[PDB]
Amino acid sequence: IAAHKGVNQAPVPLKMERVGPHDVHIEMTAQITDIEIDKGKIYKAWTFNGQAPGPLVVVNEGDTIHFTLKNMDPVVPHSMDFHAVHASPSKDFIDVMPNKSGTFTYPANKPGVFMYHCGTKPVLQHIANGMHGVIIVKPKNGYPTDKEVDREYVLIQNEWYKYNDMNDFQNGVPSYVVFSSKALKPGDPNTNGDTFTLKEKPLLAKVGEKIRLYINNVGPNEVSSFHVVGTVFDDVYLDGNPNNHLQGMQTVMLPASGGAVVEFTVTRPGTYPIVTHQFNHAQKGAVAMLKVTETGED
Amino acid sequence: IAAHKGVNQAPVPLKMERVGPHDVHIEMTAQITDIEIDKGKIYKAWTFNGQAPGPLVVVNEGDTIHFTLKNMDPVVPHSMDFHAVHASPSKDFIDVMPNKSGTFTYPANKPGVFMYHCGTKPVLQHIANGMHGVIIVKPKNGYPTDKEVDREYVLIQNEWYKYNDMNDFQNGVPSYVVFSSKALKPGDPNTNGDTFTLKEKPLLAKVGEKIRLYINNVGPNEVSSFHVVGTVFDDVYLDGNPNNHLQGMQTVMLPASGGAVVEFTVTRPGTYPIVTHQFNHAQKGAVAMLKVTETGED
Amino acid sequence: IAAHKGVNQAPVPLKMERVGPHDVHIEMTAQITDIEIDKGKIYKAWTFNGQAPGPLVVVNEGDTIHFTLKNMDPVVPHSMDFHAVHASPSKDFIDVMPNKSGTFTYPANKPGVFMYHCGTKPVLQHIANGMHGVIIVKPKNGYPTDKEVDREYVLIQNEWYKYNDMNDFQNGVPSYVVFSSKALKPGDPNTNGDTFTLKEKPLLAKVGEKIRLYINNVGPNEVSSFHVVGTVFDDVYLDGNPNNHLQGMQTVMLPASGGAVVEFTVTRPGTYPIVTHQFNHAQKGAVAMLKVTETGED
Ligand SMILES: [Cu+2]
Ligand SMILES: [Cu+2]
Ligand SMILES: [Cu+2]
Ligand SMILES: [Cu+2]
Ligand SMILES: [Cu+2]
Ligand SMILES: [Cu+2]
Ligand SMILES: [Cu+2]
Ligand SMILES: [Cu+2]
Ligand SMILES: [Cu+2]
Ligand SMILES: [Cu+2]
Ligand SMILES: [Cu+2]
Ligand SMILES: [Cu+2]
Ligand SMILES: [Cu+2]
Ligand SMILES: [Cu+2]
Ligand SMILES: [Cu+2]
Ligand SMILES: [Cu+2]
Ligand SMILES: [Cu+2]
Ligand SMILES: [Cu+2]
Ligand code: NA
Numbered sequence: 001i002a003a004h005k006g007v008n009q010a011p012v013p014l015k016m017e018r019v020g021p022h023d024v025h026i027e028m029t030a031q032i033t034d035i036e037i038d039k040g041k042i043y044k045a046w047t048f049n050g051q052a053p054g055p056l057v058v059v060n061e062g063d064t065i066h067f068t069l070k071n072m073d074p075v076v077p078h079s080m081d082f083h084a085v086h087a088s089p090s091k092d093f094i095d096v097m098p099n100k101s102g103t104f105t106y107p108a109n110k111p112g113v114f115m116y117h118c119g120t121k122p123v124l125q126h127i128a129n130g131m132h133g134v135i136i137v138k139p140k141n142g143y144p145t146d147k148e149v150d151r152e153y154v155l156i157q158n159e160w161y162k163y164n165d166m167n168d169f170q171n172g173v174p175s176y177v178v179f180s181s182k183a184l185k186p187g188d189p190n191t192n193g194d195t196f197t198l199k200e201k202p203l204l205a206k207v208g209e210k211i212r213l214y215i216n217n218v219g220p221n222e223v224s225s226f227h228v229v230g231t232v233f234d235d236v237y238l239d240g241n242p243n244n245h246l247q248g249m250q251t252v253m254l255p256a257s258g259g260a261v262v263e264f265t266v267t268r269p270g271t272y273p274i275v276t277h278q279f280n281h282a283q284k285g286a287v288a289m290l291k292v293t294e295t296g297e298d
Numbered sequence: 299i300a301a302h303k304g305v306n307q308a309p310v311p312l313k314m315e316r317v318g319p320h321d322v323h324i325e326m327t328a329q330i331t332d333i334e335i336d337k338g339k340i341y342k343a344w345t346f347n348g349q350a351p352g353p354l355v356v357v358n359e360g361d362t363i364h365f366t367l368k369n370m371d372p373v374v375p376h377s378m379d380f381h382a383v384h385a386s387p388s389k390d391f392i393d394v395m396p397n398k399s400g401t402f403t404y405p406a407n408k409p410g411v412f413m414y415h416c417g418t419k420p421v422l423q424h425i426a427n428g429m430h431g432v433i434i435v436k437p438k439n440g441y442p443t444d445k446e447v448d449r450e451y452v453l454i455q456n457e458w459y460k461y462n463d464m465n466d467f468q469n470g471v472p473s474y475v476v477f478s479s480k481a482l483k484p485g486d487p488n489t490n491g492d493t494f495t496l497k498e499k500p501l502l503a504k505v506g507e508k509i510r511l512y513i514n515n516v517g518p519n520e521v522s523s524f525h526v527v528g529t530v531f532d533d534v535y536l537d538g539n540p541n542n543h544l545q546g547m548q549t550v551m552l553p554a555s556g557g558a559v560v561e562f563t564v565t566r567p568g569t570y571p572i573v574t575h576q577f578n579h580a581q582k583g584a585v586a587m588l589k590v591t592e593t594g595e596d
Numbered sequence: 597i598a599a600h601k602g603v604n605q606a607p608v609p610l611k612m613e614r615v616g617p618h619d620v621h622i623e624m625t626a627q628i629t630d631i632e633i634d635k636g637k638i639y640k641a642w643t644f645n646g647q648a649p650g651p652l653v654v655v656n657e658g659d660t661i662h663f664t665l666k667n668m669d670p671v672v673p674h675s676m677d678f679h680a681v682h683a684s685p686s687k688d689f690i691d692v693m694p695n696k697s698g699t700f701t702y703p704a705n706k707p708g709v710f711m712y713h714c715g716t717k718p719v720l721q722h723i724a725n726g727m728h729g730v731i732i733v734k735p736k737n738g739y740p741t742d743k744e745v746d747r748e749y750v751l752i753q754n755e756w757y758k759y760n761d762m763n764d765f766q767n768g769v770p771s772y773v774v775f776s777s778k779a780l781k782p783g784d785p786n787t788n789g790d791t792f793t794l795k796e797k798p799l800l801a802k803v804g805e806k807i808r809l810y811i812n813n814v815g816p817n818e819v820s821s822f823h824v825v826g827t828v829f830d831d832v833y834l835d836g837n838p839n840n841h842l843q844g845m846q847t848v849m850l851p852a853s854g855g856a857v858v859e860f861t862v863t864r865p866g867t868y869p870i871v872t873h874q875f876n877h878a879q880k881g882a883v884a885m886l887k888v889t890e891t892g893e894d
């Protein structure tokens with residue numbers, strides 16, 4: 001797109017504030033940002049806020065979201081679809097034109113780990129170019145195993161294809177499949193989908209902890225066979241709904257856009273890979289690391 | 299197949315009648331019929347009854363089916379495998395030769411949303427050419443959320459490949475992935491797997507309704523990540539068995555041949571896309587639409 | 597690998613012995629063995645014990661495994677990762693060099709049907725070359741449907757690609773997808789992943805029996821849509837954990853590395869195919885047969 005040549009819009013922080021006991025404002029951008037998706041490989045991504053996947057959103061079950069998208073792309077319209085919400089797609093997930101803003105309001109009444117993404121046609125193009133992310137909706141009544149959890153992180157799986165190549169997006173194997181982590185608390189890492197950051201700077205934990213991961217496979221195209229090496233998932237909640245309870249899973253199958261809350265115990269010091277067990281995708285980048293120490297520090 | 303050149307056998311209605319409190323007759327054809335699978339693209343499908351997927355079958359849990367296949371194909375044998383039934387495959391799902399009929403009897407003792415398909419070797423060829431469909435077996439005791447359901451439809455996902463090309467069937471990406479809808483009640487649409495009909499003539503509902511979809515991904519080859527935009531599934535029953543109960547799912551993973559009953563609420567007027575969230579497949583046709591109005595009429 | 601040319605190390609029996617009420621010794625080899633994966637097609641597999649998938653391991657929930665790997669490969673290091681155990685990957689799933697042995701100890705505290713595989717980088721290469729298998733951990737309290745089961749077998753699904761071709765492993769479709777069966781009791785078959793053995797010598801059962809299959813799809817890359825023709829799964833336990841209970845499933849979706857215990861009834865004499873319902877994979881070998889007779893004998 002000639003109007004994207006030489007464009008690299010610096011990342012813009014997510015803005016969020018609570019405006020009532022059950023109402024939250026969220027303001028995001030759609031913007032064009034260069035991201036290093038593998039060593040030496042820049043992708044001029046279509047993004048929310050200059051991150052791909054986009055910034056983490058966390059709200060409470062029952063919150064209505066008053067969402068504003070400010071479209072900084074000079075030429076392509078963009079939009080937002082949160083899987084968390086009940087909305088009219090043709091009124092509430094509609095396009096915002098270049099250099100304009102749009103505000104849409106809708107409730108998040110279901111707990112879980114939901115994908116969000118741009119919903120502008122062709123949606124495959126918008127998602128594959130980087131416009132995907134996760135919104136977590138915290139359950140009003142928690143999860144039954146909350147009291148056992150020592151530490152938590154968010155991981156997202158996505159693919160990258162040949163740059164803005166619709167043929168490849170439709171018909172080609174991914175070039176890269178990757179994990180990123182999005183921060184829940186101060187100090188947690190906040191990374192983009194790339195082949196290397198979570199290898200070189202693993203997530204950290206301490207021997208003996210029960211870890212919770214909030215996970216989503218945003219695709220665009222692949223399913224995920226999510227596995228943590230060296231452990232078994234004690235508890236799994238499909239899509240993050242507390243009802244959807246499995247136990248003792250080695251591997252959790254995620255559809256494209258599928259989420260889960262998974263919990264596992266790390267019993268011994270060392271480094272624990274985190275994969276999709278579709279090992280062609282792991283080989284193409286989808287391995288993160290969890291470093292487990294006697295103190296929880298590096 | 300030289301004997302199929304210029305053949306286009308007009309669709310034949312399904313014939314079904316109940317012959318006892320727990321016994322039902324079903325008569326289908328195997329026939330060769332031209333179907334427009336994308337605009338300008340005719341596929342000379344191998345079909346049951348001139349539909350691909352084939353006609354909907356609905357029976358009650360505990361019904362024995364006395365099934366007759368009348369093979370109208372001039373040269374290729376065909377057969378029937380219902381996933382609903384307990385049967386001996388090598389005695390009861392056997393070939394019926396051209397211009398002959400066969401009758402086979404077997405019980406449907408399990409509630410759910412089951413694939414049916416031709417079982418003639420090579421089965422990949424028969425299924426990929428169009429010989430697939432759904433049989434619903436209604437549970438004796440219903441589903442626990444029956445009283446909440448306002449409106450229901452059936453949707454089926456399938457793929458289309460290069461015409462009768464076994465190499466492509468085994469080794470190639472689908473050319474199209476599509477939804478069709480099969481009628482449960484008078485007035486409901488009854489369509490073939492194509493890229494466009496359910497976009498141009500959406501399924502209809504009324505604001506505020508709880509909709510139930512009976513869904514099956516008949517493949518032949520792909521899994522499905524089934525999602526309705528703008529909503530969350532309140533309840534999901536895997537394979538349509540009431541026991542297999544999930545709640546609050548954004549997306550339901552279906553294996554090839556996998557079924558489900560899914561229920562969701564449409565809260566606002568507008569048009570709601572229905573996708574597989576494997577967006578390469580959505581881009582290649584697998585998007586249906588649900589139009590939600592203040593009255594339920596267009 | 598020049599050092600593998602002309603090497604075909606004869607299969608070595610698994611050695612296992614119980615050394616305490618909750619402690620078991622297991623000794624395996626890593627070795628290079630020719631396996632006929634389709635008629636006329638030899639693959640010089642990287643294996644445990646000269647089998648691919650490797651030999652069945654069965655232990656009890658709560659057993660600590662004292663595992664020794666004796667690496668007979670003349671040039672490539674190998675390792676072992678059991679999904680059943682809690683272990684430090686970087687201390688306990690580490691490489692054993694050519695002509696050396698390593699012993700690692702770790703507990704299996706979770707019941708189920710777990711993948712094991714070599715964990716040496718690149719793991720895709722080790723798994724795709726044949727270094728995969730199943731360990732079953734028997735639940736202390738059994739499964740609720742134990743008393744109904746008449747006969748049981750183990751089946752494993754894997755793929756084969758172009759020989760030791762990392763490009764194909766990452767980016768290509770499988771050349772073959774196959775089932776094998778591993779013996780639980782004297783007399784049961786014990787086979788390698790190939791396109792034909794379980795067609796030509798089906799598993800055997802008797803009319804009216806409830807059969808249990810312990811299944812795992814070891815990949816490396818594909819998901820499985822596991823289905824037995826002519827029946828419905830009465831009960832399914834995902835990953836073999838008794839908690840994860842489904843009923844009345846036509847088809848069970850397995851992620852890569854995913855396991856299950858599935859149970860079904862065979863009501864009539866005949867031959868019952870067992871497939872992945874991703875029919876491109878079935879066509880490329882992934883069909884086993886179950887022959888059901890009035891006596892249970894051939
Ligand atoms: Cu309140
Ligand atoms: Cu507001
Ligand atoms: Cu966009
Ligand atoms: Cu979506
Ligand atoms: Cu792929
Ligand atoms: Cu703890
Ligand atoms: Cu009766
Ligand atoms: Cu009759
Ligand atoms: Cu046929
Ligand atoms: Cu089938
Ligand atoms: Cu595909
Ligand atoms: Cu209602
Ligand atoms: Cu004891
Ligand atoms: Cu010992
Ligand atoms: Cu190895
Ligand atoms: Cu593994
Ligand atoms: Cu494949
Ligand atoms: Cu019995
Ligand atoms: Na308010």
Ligand code: NA
Pocket residue numbers: 318320321
């Ligand atoms: Na009768």
Ligand code: NA
Pocket residue numbers: 616618619
């Ligand atoms: Na001991």
